[PDB]
Amino acid sequence: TPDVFISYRRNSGSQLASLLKVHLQLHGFSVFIDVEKLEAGKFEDKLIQSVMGARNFVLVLSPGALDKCMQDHDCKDWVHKEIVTALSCGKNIVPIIDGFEWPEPQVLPEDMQAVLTFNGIKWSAEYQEATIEKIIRFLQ
């Protein structure tokens, strides 16, 4: 099982998620992201077990990363599923803010509003090494 599971909105956060993976692996962490380490089997089971096994849950809040989570009361969006699974397993949630504007907590489904109560790390394009070191300090 890995140390860091990176959740992200594909279209807007895939690149930064890969960047976080490369840096965290340079600092000795094992990072799971679907684009690389997702292997054979049902992707639902494998995604859920990877979230459940990872000690840390890094959430890449890219611009509009939670737009498809809103009013998703059937819990069908995968970032929504991953956030709910991380919350359920009492995971160490470390949100990464990258030009993200926090919506009202009450507009998001009740089973994930708690993600807004976690201290996040603002992504700095000018001081990426400092952001990575702060993320390391958040990781366990």
UniProtKB/Swiss-Prot annotation:
It is found in: Cytoplasm; Cell projection, Axon; Cell projection, Dendrite; Synapse. The active site is at 82. Changing residue 19 to A: Reduced NAD(+) hydrolase activity. Induction: Up-regulated by lipopolysaccharides (LPS). Predominantly expressed in brain, kidney and liver. Expressed at lower level in placenta. Changing residue 72 to K: Does not affect ability to promote axonal degeneration following injury. Residues 1-140 form the TIR domain. Changing residue 34 to A: Reduced NAD(+) hydrolase activity. Changing residue 68 to D: Abolished ability to promote axonal degeneration following injury. NAD(+) 2 binds at residues 9-10, 39. The TIR domain mediates NAD(+) hydrolase (NADase) activity. Self-association of TIR domains is required for NADase activity. The ARM repeats inhibit the NAD(+) hydrolase (NADase) activity by binding to NAD(+): NAD(+)-binding to ARM repeats facilitates inhibition of the TIR domain NADase through their domain interface. In contrast to classical ARM repeats, the last helix of ARM 6 does not fold back to interact with the first two helices, but instead turns towards the N-terminus of SARM1. As a result, the two following motifs ARM 7 and ARM 8 reverse their directions and lie perpendicularly. Moreover, ARM repeats interact with different domains not only within each protomer but also of the adjacent ones. Homooctamer; forms an octameric ring via SAM domains. Interacts with TICAM1/TRIF and thereby interferes with TICAM1/TRIF function. Interacts with MAPK10/JNK3 and SDC2 (via cytoplasmic domain). Belongs to the SARM1 family. This is NAD(+) hydrolase SARM1. It comes from Homo sapiens. The gene is SARM1.
